[PDB]
Symmetry: D2
Subunit: 139 residues, 4 copies
Amino acid sequence: AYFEYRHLVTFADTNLVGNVYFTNYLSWQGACAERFLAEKAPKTVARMHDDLALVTSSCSCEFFSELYALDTVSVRMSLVGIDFHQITMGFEYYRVTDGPARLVARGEQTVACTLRAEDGLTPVEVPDELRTALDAYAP
Amino acid sequence: AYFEYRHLVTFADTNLVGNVYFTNYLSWQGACAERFLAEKAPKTVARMHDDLALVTSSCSCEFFSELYALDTVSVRMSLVGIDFHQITMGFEYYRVTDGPARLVARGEQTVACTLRLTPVEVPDELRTALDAYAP
Amino acid sequence: MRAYFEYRHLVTFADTNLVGNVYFTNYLSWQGACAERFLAEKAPKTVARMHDDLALVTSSCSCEFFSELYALDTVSVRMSLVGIDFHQITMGFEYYRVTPARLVARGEQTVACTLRAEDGLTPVEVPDELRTALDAYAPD
Amino acid sequence: AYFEYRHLVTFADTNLVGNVYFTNYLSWQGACAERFLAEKAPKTVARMHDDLALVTSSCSCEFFSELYALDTVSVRMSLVGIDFHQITMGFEYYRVTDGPARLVARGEQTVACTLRAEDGLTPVEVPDELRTALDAYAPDPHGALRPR
Ligand SMILES: CCCCCCCCCCCC(=O)SCCNC(=O)CCNC(=O)[C@H](O)C(C)(C)COP(=O)(O)OP(=O)(O)OC[C@H]1O[C@@H](n2cnc3c(N)ncnc32)[C@H](O)[C@@H]1OP(=O)(O)O
Ligand SMILES: CCCCCCCCCCCC(=O)SCCNC(=O)CCNC(=O)[C@H](O)C(C)(C)COP(=O)(O)OP(=O)(O)OC[C@H]1O[C@@H](n2cnc3c(N)ncnc32)[C@H](O)[C@@H]1OP(=O)(O)O
Ligand SMILES: [K+]
Ligand SMILES: [K+]
Ligand SMILES: [K+]
Ligand SMILES: [K+]
């Protein structure tokens, strides 16, 4: 059980070493999670037009093998854990360019639900719609 | 007269060809203009904390020679044109070293002034500040 | 008639800035993504040469922004051939919010074909495979 | 002692939430480490023009409070450890916009020293120049008081 985001690696993704610069693997976490939100949490998305902000509280990534321009990466997001305030998502990154998929990296991101206020951010509980949509991607 | 922004070219700035990916030259236009606002237009920057949004209406850039990681680029901003609503900035990009500065790129950006968008006229403080860099 | 090659993108939070719209350089990044997908699909021998000494480098670009894009919009980037000379290719881009289609931006990029030679990048004739593939997206 | 990278936060650094998009904190790790190489490890930089590639093997960051456009961030790098071919750097991020530093984030990155071969990356020993340079930013010994 995972939510998948596929990405053709661009020239912009690369750096002078010839591989994908490491921060792009973290960017794909947000792209993957945002696609999940659009497809599975429409009410939460509507609240993010008013005052609701989902913000990263931590993230991590481990890099096992290089990706190159014109590789295709499959980013697979699953639920590591959830409580009343925060969500931890796990990510596996597969090269799917040709042949069976090969794991090239792993990572994680924890997000907190907050209200946007003038003087900072106000933690709130995970919206029910989000919790329900995420329980499908659990172990 | 020009307003100068300097940047050590990072690994992230590069791509697999080995040079600076073209969009970063445009990014530096914003970084340069921001530095200008902070130093020269505090009232306008203050309004930009509230409802004033300076939005790009067009940009361009010409790339004459490569930049590489660990080069230092000097981005030099001048005023190309201004009317009641919009501002066009010119940018020259120099590779700087202990030798003579070498022109590697040149570009332009036009910004419109808006309130969150509703167009509004260029703030006076901003017009005054920019004329210091007019031809 | 002129055909276009389409690249679609779901606008991400990373694409946005504090104003809430898409930061302007991303429209230019989409020109590269769109062109690089065209190459993969339409010019394989050229791509293979790009594993060696062939480097396609931007010589100029431009974009003009008509209406805002926001996170979770989908943009359709439509690329056509504006012109080709011996060493250089100019591609035109129209950007539409789709997420009928509503025009939001329009831009251009010129790319030089080069080989990385002893004394720097050196312009080279547009490879025949790439000339022929691009011609499918030129005026009729 | 730390190695400092200072950055004026740009509009490009921000996102719709109004704060700095989280990946930029990681990008500053690279920019900081690069500036360190440019100032402190010229032989290593020269060999990187040959075949030496320093590649990220892991990274992490935790975000305690927001940064906004026109903030100035102080990114402070220290050496956590070195193990044969890998260097682990620690980063603390401070808002310094209005004078007194305030902690806003903390992270870490491990880099592997490698040589590029036709068949891929091969780990190689950390260059002495780099080891010595980074040791200037290593904390004093701090050992458990635990009799065995
Ligand atoms: C001052 C500084 C200046 C600063 C320096 C510059 C600052 C940063 C600049 C930007 C640079 C980048 O963006 S570089 C782009 C991002 N990074 C990458 O692309 C690096 C990708 N990783 C790799 O190429 C490689 O893993 C290396 C080279 C890091 C390590 O080589 P290796 O030791 O031969 O590799 P390998 O055995 O396969 O993998 C390492 C370990 O990963 C784990 N591992 C591997 N495969 C798997 C797997 N399928 N499932 C689980 N775990 C796995 C195992 O523990 C394995 O150890 P064991 O099981 O063998 O014991
Ligand atoms: C479908 C496709 C797939 C799509 C392809 C893939 C999509 C893009 C992927 C991203 C790629 C990048 O980001 S590449 C990174 C960004 N681009 C660059 O770094 C390229 C830098 N530019 C250059 O290296 C060069 O200009 C070249 C190689 C492009 C052109 O070579 P050239 O024609 O031999 O160069 P040169 O004569 O020295 O100068 C170029 C021209 O610039 C002008 N010029 C030069 N210097 C000056 C100067 N100081 N002041 C004024 N003008 C000057 C003159 O017109 C000059 O022509 P003349 O007066 O001398 O006759
Ligand atoms: K994102
Ligand atoms: K900017
Ligand atoms: K690209
Ligand atoms: K970097």
